[PDB]
From Swiss-Prot, chain B:
This is Triosephosphate isomerase, glycosomal. NCBIfam families: tim (TIGR00419). GO terms for biological process: gluconeogenesis; glyceraldehyde-3-phosphate biosynthetic process; glycerol catabolic process; glycolytic process. Substrate binds at N11, K13. GO terms for cellular component: cytoplasm; cytosol; glycosome. It comes from the Eukaryota. Homodimer. Pathway: Carbohydrate biosynthesis; gluconeogenesis; Carbohydrate degradation; glycolysis; D-glyceraldehyde 3-phosphate from glycerone phosphate: step 1/1. Pfam families: TIM. It is found in: Glycosome. Its main location: other.
Length: 249, 250
């Protein structure tokens, strides 16, 4: 099966003009032989330079967050502005936003619906914490997270959605996630989609692993039947990202 | 003191199109500004590049509408270090919208301000009381408390990089109207507070901007007020009328 995989770089709140230009030079000189969607999500400030310097056709740029409408919201950026600016991809509901910025399942769901409605390709993040994992609550939590989003879309909307599974429980907790655990979580997600939305949708849906990925463990990870790529953190700001992209063949 | 250099700051908020902003910047570049005035344009993060490249009027500087103190694992946000790297030296912090919708408390605002000043930025720090606080005769306590929070984190010398913006939150979208007298009154209390706690030298040089509802028709009367040193403009800043606002600071 395997739908087209995605290798998304989440630069988070980082980068210098010098540092990012160098990485982008690296990326533009990289030979990519397979069918893969590479995505670079830089901070808002760097969207301009990225759009101008990244010429590799296998790459697309995306934003790391947004609000649904323009208006009196000092400091924020809305979908319309992004769209006007030529951005067609966006990452929403990232664990960091859910944890530090008050984004609940419902707000995340509203942002996604708005994004899809506006023509964006969306990378919607989901994942359970240590506590929820240890109490055997993974299925309940993740499925609830996904149901929220689903509640707002039409079957056809799924074509623009990408699900990113973040093992929040394994991030900064001292716990290590295994490729098997990742696969288990992805399968649970896909099964749900198949049963609640449709097998056609489920068969085409890309589900990315958003845990700790590096050049060393990426291939092992992509090998699993339900892993369709990665939403990478730290490694994405390094040349090693190329290795990660290569691991999706 | 005679009045310090005034500031006319445009807070574009979450708005703008490449086309619309381009026209506006064209307008601004073609405007003659005779007096000593610092003009500031705070666009969304996305539009900083284009603003920085097209705004050539020597009287204008660009600014960000918000930031976090450090870089790191904070998806969606922008840090001071990044803005600095990008050549942005001015920033608006603690806006009422951020305080109301995005969890910014006096202390969070204070930390941001301090980090900003330490990084070499000129900061426009926003303060202001709500309807409820106003009606209960609590204006002085509230605004004074907000400023003290900021003050607790700076040293005398740091004040040279701070600009206070007074937002009459109680008059914003509440159906109430602020008058030039109420504005002057709020600004005067702030100044006296600075004079007493920080120093008179600091107080005479400190710019205190008015951030309520300002337009081309009421700007002049507001600027006339002894303690008003300029404006932090909302909706009118996305319009040609912003030019009238700048001229009123003469």
């Amino acid at each position: 099966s395997k739908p087209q995989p995605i290798a998304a770089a989440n630069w988070k709140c980082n980068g210098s003009q010098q540092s990012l230009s160098e990485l982008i030079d690296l990326f533009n000189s990289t030979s990519i032989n397979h069918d893969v969607q590479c995505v670079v999500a830089s901070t808002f400030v760097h969207l301009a330079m990225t759009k101008e310097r990244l010429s590799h056709p296998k790459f697309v740029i995306a934003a790391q967050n947004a609000i649904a409408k323009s208006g009196a919201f000092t400091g924020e950026v809305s979908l319309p502005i992004l769209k006007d600016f030529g951005v067609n991809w966006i990452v929403l509901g990232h664990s960091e936003r859910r944890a530090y910025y008050g984004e609940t399942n419902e707000i995340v769901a509203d942002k996604v619906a708005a994004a899809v409605a506006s023509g964006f390709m969306v990378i919607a993040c989901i994942g359970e914490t240590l506590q929820e994992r240890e109490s055997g609550r993974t299925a309940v939590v993740v499925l609830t997270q996904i149901a929220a989003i689903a509640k707002k879309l039409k079957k056809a909307d799924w074509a623009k959605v990408v699900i990113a599974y973040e093992p929040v429980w394994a991030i900064g907790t001292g716990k290590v996630a295994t490729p098997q655990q990742a696969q288990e979580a992805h399968a649970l997600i896909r099964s749900w989609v198949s049963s609640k939305i449709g097998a056609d949708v489920a068969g085409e849906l890309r589900i990315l692993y958003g845990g700790s990925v590096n050049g060393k463990n990426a291939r092992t990870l992509y090998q699993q039947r339900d892993v369709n790529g990665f939403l990478v953190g730290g490694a994405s700001l390094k040349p090693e990202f190329v290795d990660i992209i290569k691991a999706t063949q």
